[PDB]
Amino acid sequence: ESAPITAEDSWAVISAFFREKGLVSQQLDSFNQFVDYTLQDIICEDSTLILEQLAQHTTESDNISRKYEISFGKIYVTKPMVNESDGVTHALYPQEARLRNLTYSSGLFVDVKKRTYEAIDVPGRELKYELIAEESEDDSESGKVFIGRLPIMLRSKNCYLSEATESDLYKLKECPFDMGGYFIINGSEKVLIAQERSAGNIVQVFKKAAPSPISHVAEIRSSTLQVKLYGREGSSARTIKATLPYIKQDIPIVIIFRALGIIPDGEILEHICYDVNDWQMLEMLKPCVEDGFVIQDRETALDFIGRRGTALGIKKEKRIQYAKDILQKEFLPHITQLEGFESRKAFFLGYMINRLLLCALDRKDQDDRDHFGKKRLDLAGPLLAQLFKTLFKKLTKDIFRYMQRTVEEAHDFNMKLAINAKTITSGLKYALATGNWGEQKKAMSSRAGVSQVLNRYTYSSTLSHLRRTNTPIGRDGKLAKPRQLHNTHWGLVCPAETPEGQACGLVKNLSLMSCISVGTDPMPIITFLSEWGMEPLEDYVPHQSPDATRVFVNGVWHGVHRNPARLMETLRTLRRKGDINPEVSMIRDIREKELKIFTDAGRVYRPLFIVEDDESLGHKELKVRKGHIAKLMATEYQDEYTWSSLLNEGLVEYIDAEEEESILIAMQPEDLEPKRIRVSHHATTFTHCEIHPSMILGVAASIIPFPDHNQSPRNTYQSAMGKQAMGVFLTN
Amino acid sequence: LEPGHAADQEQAKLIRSAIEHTTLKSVTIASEIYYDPDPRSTVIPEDEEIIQLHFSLLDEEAEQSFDQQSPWLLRLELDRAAMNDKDLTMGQVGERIKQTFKNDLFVIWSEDNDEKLIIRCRVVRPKSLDAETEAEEDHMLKKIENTMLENITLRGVENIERVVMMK
Amino acid sequence: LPHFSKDDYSPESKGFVENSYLRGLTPQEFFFHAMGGREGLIDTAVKTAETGYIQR
Amino acid sequence: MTTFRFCRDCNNMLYPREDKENNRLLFECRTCSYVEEAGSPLVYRHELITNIGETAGVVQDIGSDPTLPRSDRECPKCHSRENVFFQSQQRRKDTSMVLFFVCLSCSHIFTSDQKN
Amino acid sequence: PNEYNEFPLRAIPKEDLENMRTHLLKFQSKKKINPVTDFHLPVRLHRKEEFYPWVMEDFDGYNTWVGSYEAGNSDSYVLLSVEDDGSFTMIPADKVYKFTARN
Amino acid sequence: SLDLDLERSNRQVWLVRLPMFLAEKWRDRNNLHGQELGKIRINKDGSKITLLLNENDNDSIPHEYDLELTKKVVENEYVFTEQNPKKTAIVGTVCHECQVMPSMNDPNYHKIVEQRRNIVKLNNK
């Protein structure tokens, strides 16, 4: 029962995987995340609306200043239903929406509370408002203000189809072979194809050809910061300059450090360079010190900043305050926004310029822009959140404008009249139907093709359509590198199946087991990380400990550490034992002494096995055994013991395209022990195994027989032509 | 090449050297900007041997101009291989054209037989320089040293980066 | 590829297919063959248009 | 090899200056009155081409990287036959393919090129 | 090796903390600065709520320190005041200020 | 309100870092009345330090934690107090830096880490 594993067990585990997740799980999970959590936060961002009407001083009775406060509360979502022209209300089902050209959607209810404050406007004195009237109907059903209608994706949590059995689907006349994952808009089925994006909060070092004085560039997007190094290699003149937002001329780096709060010159180099012995680092930083030593004053730099604003002739002190506020408000917002976090910003700027200068000293290379680990996929959820935020902002602006208008006439406003509930509904319906992802007024410049009409020609065509990703680069753009297949696509993208013509390589189809992460909070991770022996970045001195690992969380440096091996072992223990959900990625780079933790959304991951060293057998072996496979067979035939049972026991692990840079995988299980030509790989420190190589293929190419005896373009051609065969697209 | 020189490699390499663009920055393994406060004597033993060579080999005008030599030095440790590749004699090419161009930089230079080819490039300026000017030694000399490395052409024709032999 | 070791220069690790279409391709050489084919696919799909413009 | 020198008062780097009546070099801080006596006529250095031997880079805890290969060569110091080996980690274009071996036990660095 | 010493853990009541507001006073220097010699008593400390930075000037004006508030110190520090009985009393930390010397 | 009280500032003061939950639990006002709430134990070699909470406290909190040394020598840190221009008084100079971690021997660690799991699951973004 302690025996090794054979490929039959691999197919057993895959059978369990598809019996648990499904082929369209990504859309459903993104929609559930959006509806349950993000929708509440989008309104809670802008709950309070304030009107401050000062006294017109026309008469004594007009000397009272007024304040109006509007606040929002919970969100309630009903099951989809329709009200006919007669005013009768009945629950709407997909058949009626399809036949009658309706729109599958539901209604949204939000709590609203109002407050009125009145103060006596005494000139020369601060206004002291007092609570007088507060309208809050939380104790009655009239408090739920109807705000709009939201489309519903099939088979999601709200839809009636979620809990339907086979006889339920037949009496309602469903195809049991239908999976959901699409909207019904205007009586036609629509689907949202995943949209590819380049990640943010990651410093990237580039390079330039030299007809121009530019030599290197360091980029970060949080708001953008460019710290450029000018001066050719080997010359005496070295310049390092940063380009801040709303500052045009630009100013050097030592001036930035002086303005930021680090006055002494010796501390600058402790911020930049983390190795005392290296002399080339300081040699390249010498001209910066020489030029920045002339001015020991923040205020000259702040005067530099003040002149370049649109307003001209401002007094010096106001310019000082403005330039002071620019740093904490718009300079690297992804670290912090509130006041007093200057040490973190100074160290992060030092780290960025350190990495730029390291690349400038040929110790490393340019960042690869094609690496699939630096790309995120936007599903229905994020796109809906974007559009909902925009429309809600416009709607609340309109409410404020109308309420001001009715205050001008001294008329009480009806909250059920100030709201134009048609704005949200019309905007969402127009965006989903036309596909132009933007406002109706500015739809010309918005993204297109985001929403497409589902293809039902054959069943495999529906399957292939619900699993498609688009790379929003100009399809006539002559950039060859995004088109070509890249080393990081192993197991996450189908190599065979791609369109032909102008969309070659730009349209991608996932493999059978490449899921996507939903999103999770980073705060508990940071709290635990500081709990288990992490020194904060405030109390970090380079010279006391020059061999300290740096610690990152989603691209913001929080400090250092001294013994990282046990931290990684404990972190992976907790990730494997369910204390943290396995969608979080945790990489360690030994060569540069770095730790990176990612908890964001949009990362493609695939399952893999786990290799551990068994001393009783004297060598390594998988954690999985014949007992687990027997339990899987028992549960499958009984259709308990499921895929999550394997996951929580530390038998499988989800690996993205970034952690893969620091692992070793044995492809066949028998390759882990000490026709065709199969070579015995020299490795002996294996960490994971491939569940099965066949899964590196999509859904289209999983029907060719013996695909490896074929030239690859032939596999591509059949993956194309498999969507034009005639057959039973649905059993109903 | 010419009909006579076509079959022999040596005239071909002479022509190849005579065509390629050669500049000072390419021929210095260490064109190091050093402090040269008193060029009369140094601490490094290697340049000390070269010192007495020219100090017994300088004319009366050079003896008068001893004070014109900059308080900083272009100390040229020159690579033997690069110098011999372009058939570049140390003295004639190092000094004739360089002093002829603007009478800007004088040199104490050794014969090629020394194990370390060390040149001392000391710029020449009138003593009539202003007090504020004379105080800012480094300010003039770093700039003129950069303009010296970049803008002096020992031999060759412009814009031709490489020349290569083929059969 | 994640199945190799750092600084590997052997032919089988750098895209050499020692099998045949009658024998069968192992996964890694299958992947490398796929990239090789993708190159020519792209070539046709775009340089059709460029050559069209030149011809006109 | 010129080294930066910081003033003992405000940590600012010391600028050179000359003393004509004694003809001696000094380092002064432009912000305070500190002056210190120069010990050598070597203040600045500008090399052009780097004749640096290729370096293995960071070595600390390199034996726990599981993507690094192995070898059975014998240690020249502790006579152990297990070690890690890798190519030069400096990314110059023209670097040769000369290996570097780090011993498992004594953490000793050596190369496969035994040139006398 | 199991010999240990005994330090009881005491605290300071609310009546003393009400009129005693604590503030972490941090000086930036590369040298061990002590007020016994480097400060000529008395010292003048004022603010010229966190908008005005702290200013600590000596009687002769030679030693002037300007202190700014550093925020985001997520570590809630504690003060361990030693009493006459050798016990340690806890004092919660309210604010942290960093001082630098005037040029 | 100008002079500094240095008459009793000669004694060295420990610098200890407490965990967030433990520190917040120790900010309780009712327990500030000079009550003896815990004790420390120092090894003969001084490498291992154990903090044991007194039994007078509720059994809902772990009664054992361990301490680790960050810097063997700690310099240029002073502890002050300010009371009612405000009158300031230095308390002393900092001697050692130590950090608190939960003890594995006390099972209550798991419980609070269980609560940590309870913290992890509820909040979402």
Coordinates of C-alpha atoms in Angstrom, one line a residue, chain A residues 207 212 233 237 328 330 380 416 517 560 569 605-606 630 648 662 688:
Chain A
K207 CA 17.8 49.3 -22.5
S212 CA 20.4 59.2 -28.4
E233 CA 29.4 53.8 -20.7
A237 CA 29.7 62.3 -16.9
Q328 CA 3.1 62.1 -0.3
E330 CA 1.4 61.3 -6.0
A380 CA -15.8 39.2 -16.3
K416 CA -37.0 58.4 -5.2
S517 CA -6.6 33.0 -9.1
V560 CA 14.5 42.6 5.8
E569 CA 9.9 26.0 5.2
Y605 CA -1.7 28.2 -12.2
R606 CA -1.7 24.5 -12.8
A630 CA -8.2 3.3 -3.9
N648 CA -5.5 19.9 2.0
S662 CA 12.7 27.6 -8.7
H688 CA 7.4 17.8 -8.0

